[PDB]
Amino acid sequence: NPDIKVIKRVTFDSSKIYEAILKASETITPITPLIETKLEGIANRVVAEINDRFSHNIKIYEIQSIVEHELLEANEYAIAQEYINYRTKRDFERSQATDINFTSDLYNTQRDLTAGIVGKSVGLKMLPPHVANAHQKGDIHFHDLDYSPYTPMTNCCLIDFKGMLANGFKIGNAEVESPKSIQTATAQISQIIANVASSQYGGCTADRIDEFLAPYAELNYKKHLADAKEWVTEEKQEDYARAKTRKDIYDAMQSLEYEINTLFTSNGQTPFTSLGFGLGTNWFEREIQKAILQVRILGLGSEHRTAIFPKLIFTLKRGLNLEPNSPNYDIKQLALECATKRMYPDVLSYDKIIELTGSFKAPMGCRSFLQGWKDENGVEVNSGRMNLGVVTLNLPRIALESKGDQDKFWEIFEERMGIAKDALVYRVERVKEATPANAPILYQYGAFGQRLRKCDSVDQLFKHRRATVSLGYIGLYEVASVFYGSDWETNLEAKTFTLNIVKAMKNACESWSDEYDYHFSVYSTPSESLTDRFCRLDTEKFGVVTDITDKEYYTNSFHYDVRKNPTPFEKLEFEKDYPEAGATGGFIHYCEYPVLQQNPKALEAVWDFAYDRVGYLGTNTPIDKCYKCDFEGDFTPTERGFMCPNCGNTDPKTVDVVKRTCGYLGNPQARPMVKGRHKEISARVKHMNGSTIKYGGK
Amino acid sequence: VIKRDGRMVTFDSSKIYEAILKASETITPITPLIETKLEGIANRVVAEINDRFSHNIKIYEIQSIVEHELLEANEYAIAQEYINYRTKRDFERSQATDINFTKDSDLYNTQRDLTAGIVGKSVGLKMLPPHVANAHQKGDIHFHDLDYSPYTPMTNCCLIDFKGMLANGFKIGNAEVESPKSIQTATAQISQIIANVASSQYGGCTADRIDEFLAPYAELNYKKHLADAKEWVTEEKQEDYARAKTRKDIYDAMQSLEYEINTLFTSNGQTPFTSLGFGLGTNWFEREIQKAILQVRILGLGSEHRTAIFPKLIFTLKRGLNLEPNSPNYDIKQLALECATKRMYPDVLSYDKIIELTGSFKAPMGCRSFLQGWKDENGVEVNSGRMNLGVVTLNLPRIALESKGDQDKFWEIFEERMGIAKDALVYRVERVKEATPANAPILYQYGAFGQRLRKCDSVDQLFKHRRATVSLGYIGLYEVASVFYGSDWETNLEAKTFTLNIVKAMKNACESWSDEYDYHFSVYSTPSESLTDRFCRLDTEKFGVVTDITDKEYYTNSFHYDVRKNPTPFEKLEFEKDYPEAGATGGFIHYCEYPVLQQNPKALEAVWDFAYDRVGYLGTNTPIDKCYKCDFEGDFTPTERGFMCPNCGNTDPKTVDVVKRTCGYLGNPQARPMVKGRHKEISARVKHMNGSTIKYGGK
Ligand SMILES: Nc1ncnc2c1ncn2[C@H]1C[C@H](O)[C@@H](COP(=O)(O)OP(=O)(O)OP(=O)(O)O)O1
Ligand SMILES: Nc1ncnc2c1ncn2[C@H]1C[C@H](O)[C@@H](COP(=O)(O)OP(=O)(O)OP(=O)(O)O)O1
Ligand SMILES: Nc1ncnc2c1ncn2[C@H]1C[C@H](O)[C@@H](COP(=O)(O)OP(=O)(O)OP(=O)(O)O)O1
Ligand SMILES: Nc1ncnc2c1ncn2[C@H]1C[C@H](O)[C@@H](COP(=O)(O)OP(=O)(O)OP(=O)(O)O)O1
Ligand SMILES: Cc1cn([C@H]2C[C@H](O)[C@@H](COP(=O)(O)OP(=O)(O)OP(=O)(O)O)O2)c(=O)[nH]c1=O
Ligand SMILES: Cc1cn([C@H]2C[C@H](O)[C@@H](COP(=O)(O)OP(=O)(O)OP(=O)(O)O)O2)c(=O)[nH]c1=O
Ligand SMILES: [Mg+2]
Ligand SMILES: [Mg+2]
Ligand SMILES: [Mg+2]
Ligand SMILES: [Zn+2]
Ligand SMILES: [Zn+2]
């Protein structure tokens, strides 16, 4: 009956079931119409029984079982005996194939490297065949094979810290109740982040940190007020309590900030965590925001090194803090100084984001985002969601192999979108194989909003479009340049073509989301591990191509060509169209600047201009420092990294260089990057005219 | 639920699990490890059955899920024995009208670490020299922790020089931090240092004299609070205020240390093995630090007041300081008495006994290891900053069995095995020497080993001149004595002399090796963390069941008195005091079993006072298990599949709370159950004092 579908490892096919009975039977006896009048009744019975019970969907293993009982029911044993011995023998064949026992760096990093090599080796065989071939050939790119599909792994998530900190939780070998202070709250925040980072292969974010940290500031205030009433005179109670509470808040901030920058995971790297704030109204939230900004401004240790993680993310709201008469303008000035001195934080626009996605929430992960979602109770919830997995297309390759023909380009585009849909469905189904006991921090103690049991299934946290899945892309500029040359931003035809590409991607994602009941959204791939393999594996097959492959990298998604130097206003006006057109699952814009430490007004003007147009902005200032000769400014890039342009100094021990790589920053000296990423960073040019040097040097 | 015939029955999760019990039954009798694994598979099927169906469920599709679930969980052996048994019954169940016929419950990082360890072990087994590798595989000796070494030039233990490297500052992760200006910051830095160090090694770690180097930071907090009081509070109360707040802050500085250490884990996926020592403080700050540590351990962990497992607090007893009732620190000793009675921790050390046994006084190293008196070139004696290097274990019962009652043949094989072990130890030290300071900047580059070295330098500077201790393991003195003189040799002077001669020969061989190779070689009573789970099983295959050698399915741990016998602790300690004096000074610990004495610490105080002069390291075990379903605390009956409450029969770890001392570090059964070999050791333990083993029954 049409009312029932079928789920593969597609519509129900009585012929497909009828073929299974026949092909097994022919192992021992020839086909003869003397017994086929019975086998047809056998296949009809197994169809009429499936229809009577299951109405939504059926797995393949249940199709096999529902036949085996029916074969035994109709007094048949000759072929059923042969039926089982092949189905079982094949079942261990696929499991034994995907078996581990099928045989100047930190020690944990080496052990994780070997484990990841083994995991990639088993997962490549675990993957379905055609998607594996596409990934190997380079048509598409699976993401982070070193952990999936070998183990059920979620890409990145928005940790619900409010839920845990409300009613306590359990971590490690201990279980704890709700914190009764602010320093305790920050310590638990850091410990929880560290524990979560080892149970997933991506970043994490703490949205509205001040909003859910305010009650513990109130608790500290009450404790200090009681202590003052006991000890100090009845005239200076309020002043002493407020001063002690402020000092405790700032101290807790320092602790957390430093705790994140120290703890690592099995990978041996600092977790890719980030924080967001800016919606505070009362006094405690304002003090918390001031403490965060000040502790980021101060530095990292005795040398006042630039902090890399967590990635702070500000929030600009009209009426809250946008204009000089706004009640939180001082916080905005502090954030401006922090941005011009430490390249952080990134500013978010309340109205633009709430219009684009559906509800304001901090970008969880590197640059990912979530649409507005409500549960059965009608209350909107943002913290507690997650992204299962990501794969990325190869738009420049499709553009290049099209030989300048648009219709053929669209045909191969549809083919690749189908391949990517199959990959995404497999990734979702593999993730759905997780169990709460696999990670009690995530699925058992409120990391996802709900607290299930080992008796329950994890799919309750993913269905009804609660959990998003991102399909990535890269190199829209190269795609347009294939057909319209290097300079096409002044042409409406190429811009319309790119917008149509994004719109087709969005429409396919919407159709898939409606079909599979998971929010399939497009995604701006951050080129974390994409261009390094993509450029070389495409230049091996297509050769050197002018302005498309000779750069030795791929332009990230839809941003303006980094080789060009337009004014930031022009760049933002050009770029505002893509997120509006459907590129809403993840996006971030960049703006280069000279040293603006003595002139932060330009950044304020840019933020005010970008508030209405874009919903996400990032600054790129030359804040590199060389302690040997007290140099401050930019660094000249070479194939061996960077060096100070006064002494040739290059060792990471006495130099400080950070550059924005993929949403996050990174220090290339302490961790060298791939050559493609290095070429991409070097090719970057400044946007507004100014001297990129603060202190000349000794 | 729809039965095969029909009708309606309730869905019981026990019926699903009981079948899987018979599944693995045909292949292997129920074991504690397989108990959780079997119920791990039983947890997936119960989750899936209710997911697919809503109103009715019959049997011939649940049998499909469990058939599928076993395959999906890599357990083919149970599945291979399931399907054939499953398929057999339905065929016979069929009846014609006339004539018929004629793995998934572990953490992600845990699984990844398991895979990495398997790869490392496979590489290391071929990295070894031939004869030592063959001896290890044959069960002749044990090369400890092949998972991490010699694949990586690891290190066994490390006495983190917390004082100096905290005072001078250090760089961890991506952040360089200076000296702390508060005790809370100091304890946070200590916790992160411990976590990083444990991540950079395959063994335990400890912090000795924590109060001694934590006093200055408490003084700094006191000074800051005094400065604040001089500006806020009135005059006559000022100093008093500066006390109270400080007394609170120190408490917090310990409270975090109780949780952070418990929470943070290494790449292995388990809490790092770590311990703390104290007791030598004299001034007010050190006294308050010790009181805070004891109080936070007493209070418990979390809302359920669960017993803490780590770190292992280790008290220190000194005559004229904290021993006699007239001593200035007798209240601290009484608090330690209560805490040890109610929490199995801390253990004790004798200042004079230890300082005369191992040259100087130092906290025991990691699990049970020890160091020896040592002075650097400048002549200043240094204790913290040294490190152990590696451990291998001898199979004494194998030598005893191959002797067949001939002492001279026993000595011949003993010398042969000593030569093999010396070759193994030299190879392990040489492999470790191949490390580079950049391999772990926390250890070799930032003061965690004492000296600080640059990248372009060799690690041998931190190991040579007998600085780094290197230890050789042994186990089963009671078994080798009973092979010759019967299982009741405790009253025979000749057998005791024979065992002491064995220990003396080992000590002399270690001394000669240390003289030759310029590394301190010391015999070390290895803890049976997994040795008896492997040594005994491999021995019982080659030699069969022997009379009170292998029938017990375990090996007696080093020189300890026979576990089956129950002598009063005074005679037990009198008997056991001779072995460490004979030369077994590299590592040891003396256990002591008591009934529930919560309202009677006087017996424990008397035992400690008696053992201060004779024994240098004592650990008391008292049943402190407690379950919350029926609210009973006391002892537990060691059933085959772990443990259960004697009253309500509860087993679930989410409600029960049982702690047992498993070779130095008290473990957590029902959390990570141990091998069946060790479970027999715990079950066979007795109580060395007459008294009730229960405290308060259930409801
Ligand atoms: N579209 C379908 N409708 C109903 N049953 C199906 C359908 N496809 C497969 N089945 C059932 C019939 C058999 O009992 C069982 C195996 O059929 P099969 O086509 O081999 O699936 P499959 O996923 O293994 O494809 P293949 O074997 O080519 O990899 O699955
Ligand atoms: N040799 C055989 N003897 C009896 N029945 C068989 C035999 N081969 C196949 N069948 C039946 C049972 C199988 O479920 C069905 C489909 O065949 P087949 O695709 O080869 O196995 P499978 O569907 O379980 O996995 P896969 O197709 O991917 O190998 O036809
Ligand atoms: N009433 C039930 N509730 C839940 N599961 C059941 C129930 N009855 C049987 N099962 C499941 C548990 C096992 O996975 C599988 C086989 O168990 P089994 O005890 O042999 O069933 P059964 O019907 O044969 O009982 P019996 O042999 O006493 O009649 O069926
Ligand atoms: N000896 C065994 N070895 C391995 N698995 C077994 C063994 N005995 C039983 N099992 C498994 C498979 C059985 O389906 C299940 C329940 O046992 P059993 O009751 O004997 O068969 P059954 O319940 O499926 O049919 P029935 O109720 O008619 O006996 O447990
Ligand atoms: C990681 C961590 C957890 N916790 C847990 C332990 C407790 O279960 C929970 C309660 O935190 P607290 O607020 O410290 O509870 P308290 O009873 O000690 O109150 P006060 O400090 O004012 O005397 O927080 C800490 O206290 N400190 C830490 O560093
Ligand atoms: C991980 C961690 C580091 N640190 C670092 C920060 C400093 O570099 C060093 C000294 O500790 P601090 O006492 O914080 O130094 P300070 O200059 O901020 O003085 P105060 O807090 O009294 O105002 O320890 C912490 O303070 N807390 C932490 O949790
Ligand atoms: Mg098939
Ligand atoms: Mg039965
Ligand atoms: Mg507290
Ligand atoms: Zn310079
Ligand atoms: Zn009970």
TrEMBL record, chain A:
One of its GO terms (cellular component) is anaerobic ribonucleoside-triphosphate reductase complex. It holds the Pfam family NRDD. Residues 564-690 form the Glycine radical domain. GO terms for biological process: 2'-deoxyribonucleotide biosynthetic process; DNA replication. Residues 4-94 form the ATP-cone domain. One of its GO terms (molecular function) is ATP binding. InterPro entries: ATP-cone_dom, Form_AcTrfase_GR_CS, Gly_radical, NrdD. The keyword S-adenosyl-L-methionine does not apply. Its EC number is 1.17.4.2. It comes from the Bacteria. PANTHER family: ANAEROBIC RIBONUCLEOSIDE-TRIPHOSPHATE REDUCTASE. This is Anaerobic ribonucleoside-triphosphate reductase. It comes from Streptococcus thermophilus.
TrEMBL record, chain B:
Coiled coil: none annotated. GO terms for cellular component: anaerobic ribonucleoside-triphosphate reductase complex. Its EC number is 1.17.4.2. InterPro entries: ATP-cone_dom, Form_AcTrfase_GR_CS, Gly_radical, NrdD. Residues 1-93 form the ATP-cone domain. Pfam families: ATP-cone, NRDD. Keywords: ATP-binding, Nucleotide-binding, Organic radical, Oxidoreductase. GO terms for molecular function: ATP binding; ribonucleoside-diphosphate reductase activity, thioredoxin disulfide as acceptor; ribonucleoside-triphosphate reductase (thioredoxin) activity. This is Anaerobic ribonucleoside-triphosphate reductase. It comes from Streptococcus thermophilus. The lineage of its organism: Bacteria, Bacillati, Bacillota, Bacilli, Lactobacillales.
